[PDB]
Amino acid sequence: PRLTPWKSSDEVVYLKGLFFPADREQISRDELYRQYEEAISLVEMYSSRTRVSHILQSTAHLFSALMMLESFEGLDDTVRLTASMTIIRFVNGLLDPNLHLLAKKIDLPSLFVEFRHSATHDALPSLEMCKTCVDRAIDWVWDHYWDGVEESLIKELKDLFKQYRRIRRQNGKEYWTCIAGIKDHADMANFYNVMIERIVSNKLKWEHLRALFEPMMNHFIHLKGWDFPLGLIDSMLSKCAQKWIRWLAIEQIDRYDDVLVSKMIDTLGKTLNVELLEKLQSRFSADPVIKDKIQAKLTLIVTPTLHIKSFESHPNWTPKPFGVI
Amino acid sequence: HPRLTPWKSSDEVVYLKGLFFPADREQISRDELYRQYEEAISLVEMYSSRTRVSHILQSTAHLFSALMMLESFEGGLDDTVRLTASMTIIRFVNGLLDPNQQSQAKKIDLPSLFVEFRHSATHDALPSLEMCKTCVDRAIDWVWDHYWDGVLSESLIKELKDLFKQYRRIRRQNIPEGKEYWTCIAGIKDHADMANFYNVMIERIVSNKLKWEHLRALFEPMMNHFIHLKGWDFPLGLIDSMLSKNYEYSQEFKCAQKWIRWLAIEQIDRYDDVLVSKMIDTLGKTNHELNVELLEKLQSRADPVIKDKIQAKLTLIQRLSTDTKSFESHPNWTPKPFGV
Amino acid sequence: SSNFSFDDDNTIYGHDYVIFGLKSNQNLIVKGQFVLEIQRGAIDINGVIYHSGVEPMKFINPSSSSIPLIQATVLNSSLLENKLFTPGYKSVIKLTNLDTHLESIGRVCPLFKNLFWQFDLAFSDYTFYPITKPDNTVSVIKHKNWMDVIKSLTELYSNDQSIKVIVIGGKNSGKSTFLRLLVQHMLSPTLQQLPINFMDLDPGQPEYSGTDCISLSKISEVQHGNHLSLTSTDSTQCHYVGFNSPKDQPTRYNLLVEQLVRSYESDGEKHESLLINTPGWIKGYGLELTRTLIERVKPTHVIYLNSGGVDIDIPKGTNLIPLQGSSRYSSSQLRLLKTMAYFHKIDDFKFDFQPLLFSPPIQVSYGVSTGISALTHLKETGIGMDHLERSIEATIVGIFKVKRDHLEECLFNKGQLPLLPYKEFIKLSTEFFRLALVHSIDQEKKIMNLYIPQFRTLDLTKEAIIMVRGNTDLPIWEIASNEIVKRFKRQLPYITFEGSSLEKKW
Amino acid sequence: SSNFSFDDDNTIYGHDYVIFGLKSNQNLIVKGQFVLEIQRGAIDINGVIYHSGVEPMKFINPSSSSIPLIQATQVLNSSLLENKESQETPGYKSVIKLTNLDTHLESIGRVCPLFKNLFWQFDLDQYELAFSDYTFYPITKPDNTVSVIKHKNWMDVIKSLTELYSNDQSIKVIVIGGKNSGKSTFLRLLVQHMLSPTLQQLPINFMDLDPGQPEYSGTDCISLSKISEVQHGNHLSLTSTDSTQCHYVGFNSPKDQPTRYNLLVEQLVRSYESDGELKHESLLINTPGWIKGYGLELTRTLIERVKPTHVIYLNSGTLGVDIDIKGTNLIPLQGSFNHSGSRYSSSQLRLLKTMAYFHKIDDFKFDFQPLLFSPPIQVSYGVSTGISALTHLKETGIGMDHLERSIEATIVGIFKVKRDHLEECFNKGQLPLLPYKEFIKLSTEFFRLALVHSIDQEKKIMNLYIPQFRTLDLTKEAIIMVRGNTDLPIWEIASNEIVKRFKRQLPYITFKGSSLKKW
């Protein structure tokens, strides 16, 4: 179980996008260098939290160093140093898990062998040569490291929810617990909304679908981190579904909190159809500064209030794996 | 024995001691000490351009461009700054160590830090900014103690005395044997290569102490023979020296000019314009009355082009004294070191 | 082939503690963590003999560290009142089981478990086990000189007044072993009892310091076990180097050191007489760090464990000793444990090692609002402001104390997290409060979620919250412990399953 | 200690020239410069048979280079040789003679007591009667003076190549070796073979891309020259050797202008693919010293860029993997062998080569009296049409004010530019200082390198010293100039006879230093 600086695995293939455009041409010759500087401050950033693969880290310098070798147009001594040192370090790093033989297996180009030697023991190699190197090496990493680079759970969640539908249907206890357990199974995934498609599935009638649906919606709300209650609507934006939203609108007013209000501002944008906002706008009623603010949003076709924290232990808290707040 | 110095006159390196290090290390502005550093480095690169420069100096001109590199920093990404300084630290040590055949010791006395610095930079984690910055000055100072502080700021008489004296007997001689006399005269003449020699002539005339003009007369076959032998070149540097000598001076005062007339009378015939000017300007250089007089003398001595210049300068020296071309060889050539 | 004196029948199997009567020609060797009164006699351990009168002492000898032998080797005027059926052999040692819940490390890491006293002749199972049959694990010994050199000072100690004292050693030098060897001798209440004053300046191999700290620590009692600084000896200030080693902030590190000997200077002269450790580094700059240190200290004495010395030569009087030194399994990895251990201590000698998720963690809000005001980055200060907030997360950050007026200072960017530029940060007086690990940070409320090992709730009026992210790493187990990958189905917020060419930390 | 048939060959001293009569076995090492005709018989030199008919040849073989043996081994083989006899013919083998070169190359010595006896002018009691002194003579009595013969493969492989030539086919050949490999002695060894009289005198195309240790190139030049006549000794770029062009690389080594270097070569390749194609002359090549790192890389790029015709390598290598087998040859390293004192440092022998260029009156006449005596070919400063600007080859960044100083006392290249081509876009002002960036872009043909003497700050004109030229008259093309990396030989600025003239403080020199740091 190795440790990864990039919290998602994912931001890696995103760090191949910036370093390499792929749609390399045709693009602005400074957009190369605006993307590179997010990726260079990330590898620095990615490097800062924890060690990063040497191969990866050197890319970060190599690209920046190349940035040195273009923006340039005077006294070149410093810029034969940045790129030389990076190349020299870069080669020095690649080699050292332990000489003519060693390069051949390693496959570092022979010239790549020379430059470290020449810069180290000789006149600074010319900037024009370095460009050959910095680029040449850069191709190298792409050549090697860069170029190369549930069902059961779902069913159980579904079962749990379905169990809930039966429990309500009969119309504290351990069975009460069964509902609580379900809530965690939906927090963990990003598919909590996926149920929402499911809840619609149970519904056969107005309110009565709500009546069984309704107790949960309030309860999910009552414990904190009830943004998902805002969150579900985000799923809702895809928008029978509409009926839920209005009740969501009716329910939201009931959830009369600034964050709850906040969802609506977030909520209003999700709802392109005039009616959803209007009911939204209508409910807001345009009296608060936020109420004033919302109209601006509506017009468009924003932070309401301070959010405060303290050294107080979270009151209700479940195991979260250094992720998902 | 000789070697090629990039800097002409081996003077500036002394200067560079001033440029790289200012005499005062605190009072002068950093913005201006940083201007100061810039001038020094540029010459060195130029010096590198002219010829290879001792690696101490090559690294001195890298070390000060890495001191401004580190100290001038405005914050942000120190990825770039470490590399520039780091190589500079690294390149430098290597040069000193490198002319090291065996047993690689610090007999050279390079400090402990510097070996440390390379390894961290060379293979280990890059050195931190404070680390480079602390080190270079440590590095910067070392050269100053090691190298920089340290770099700080006859046959002829006999020939003239024996090339002129021998003639004097010859002067006595005048109303094979003929061969020696020509040779002695020639010998002084070939002999008087020297820049020094013109000064010698003035001394010689004074030395006579008791000579009538005729004693000069013995000289004249000799003096012209010199004018004879080498030509017109001789009386130039002979008058371009008497005049400077005369100006310096302003019978010994008296005797020469009288010679000067003797010189004065006979060569205006053979004289070009450009040289008369070389006299007219040298004559004008003197504020002394003497030369004002020599000017009128040259003036009264046919040719209208010359007569305007002697006068044009003359009334100026009478009014400063009352003040109270491409792909052609050299017209007149006199070999010089690739100086001048 | 170290073996300990073995007693049977005379040996007593007693409940929750072990008591033995020891023949004079006997030695006792103990693994584990035990509290020890003595019943009758004098026991000299590692050249220190402790009388019957003295109060029981707590030992946390670890498997990796060399054991401190408990010699019967034996008459002390009383004073010490020794004290049960049989007089037996000359000395009567009393052993009591210690519940410190150390040895619970086994739960977190499989390899780590064996270090302490748990099981994994007829022997009852408690925290402490004596290895009668000679076995591979080491027994404490030192050259007499090594004992003597620390020993020699002590007589000076009895007389007035203060001796300032330095050591220098390689990281693997075993001086750290050297520096706790001393503290026992001067302390022992056969001697002047004034609290020896103590300074630790090596972050890399700190003692009396959870990782990446330098410490002045007034040592009053006798740490008889290879405490990792897990037990508390009162100290005025930890101080956060933020780096494993001096190099990361030479200016910060040197500027800090001088600000610690001051308090030391205040009590350097105040009967208690100063003690110090130096970075293991002797090669290169850290010698200039040792030599710069020597002059400021005006230390009375100094010690070096190896020869290679001349710079150290002037002007202080110096002592050259044997390499000594001492499974870890790797000494370098031990750092994580000293680092990890900080969190799992409810109180000294009591550590819960259930993974740190399952507790209710602490929120504070990253706003000009008091609880947390700002964060600042040591080392690289050019992390883009929109990447700082994600950098802090999944890291082992440390919270700080600054005064409010100073606190106002010049945060740079208020929205989200108000970054504090480093340059401003060094300048202000800072007082450290506690280590922290933050499970996650919420963008949405700006509230941030952090674990801290233990605290009094940090009440203050307008002392701005202080943060810093140094170089100290995170032990893997807390995120990925087999315990927290079976109760959390495998997925990696930050972690991955075990190969491409080529990518592995240089 | 090699030896050559002594004689005892009924020699007549003559006066100017010495005439040799050879029994079949005897063959001669000759030490020095000389020209030879052949009066009877068929002498063969280095595995090539030359008869009476053939026009004479000029030898500059030098102590540093190996000595080309002059075999008499070939029996008269064809009616092709004609013999002219006014002497003795007698029925004994072949009669041949050469007469003194009179190069005047000999006076290396005055500048350099190191260089004395590179060419033999009597450099101590005589041990032998019949001794005479001339520009040329044998080592009749063995000494460690280097003969030249190469493995029959080495001779054969090139000789193996030659046979193909008689038939219509044209071979574009390569060669690659490390300096001291013997490529320089080898590539000399081939063009002799091809140009040999039996073959039709197509002028063999020879390309030299080697700036450090060139052959048929001034120091830091690249040139492809049709060679119509054989250089029979190792003339160090000392022969008329008519060729299309020289290009000023500006460095000892390829990398000095890597972007500039590669670009320069290709264009060079187009006049070689303009005429290489003709096949009247098979293209030939010299390849730089580098065999690992870029030079191998330039080489592969070089190898692909032009068809090999044939590819040769002197030692087994990691190179062999890198470049495809494209069929290619492998011969042994065969590095030329001499004592360094005997065979002067490659960086040390360049100074002779750098030096020789200024001092050559004509291809076969050399004056070694220091340059200072001669007039300086004084030229304009500023936007004047004579010379227009200086663009620095590599150390482009410098103070504008300083740059004028830099030029003096250096070897700089005289370029040709036409019309406003020069005008493509500093201070006029002390100097134009046209930049490198602007320069790489402009087309440019290169004039012979120029010494700089006594550049005049006061008025634009700067004395210059330069080698032989027809008047450099161009209607609009200014002499754009370039200070690269090429050094200054010590002797010309300071030699023994120049110290004598003044003994004055060096304008740029100093006169024992020990200890304190060259890299």
UniProtKB/TrEMBL annotation, chain A:
GO MF term set: endonuclease activity
One term under GO cellular component: Las1 complex
Organism listed in the record: Cyberlindnera jadinii (strain ATCC 18201 / CBS 1600 / BCRC 20928 / JCM 3617 / NBRC 0987 / NRRL Y-1542) (Torula yeast)
Record's protein name: LAS1 protein
Gene Ontology annotations of biological process type: maturation of 5.8S rRNA; maturation of LSU-rRNA
UniProt-listed InterPro entries: Las1
From TrEMBL, chain D:
Disulfide bond annotation, renumbered to this chain: 221-246
Coiled coil: none
Residues of the Clp1 P-loop domain: 177-359
Keyword entries, A-Z: ATP-binding, Kinase, Nucleotide-binding, Transferase
UniProt keyword Hydrolase present: no
A Pfam family hit: CLP1_P
GO molecular function: ATP binding; polynucleotide 5'-hydroxyl-kinase activity
GO cellular component, one term: nucleus
Keyword Transmembrane annotated: no
GO biological process, one term: cleavage in ITS2 between 5.8S rRNA and LSU-rRNA of tricistronic rRNA transcript (SSU-rRNA, 5.8S rRNA, LSU-rRNA)
Family affiliation: Belongs to the Clp1 family. NOL9/GRC3 subfamily.
Protein name stated in the entry: Polynucleotide 5'-hydroxyl-kinase GRC3
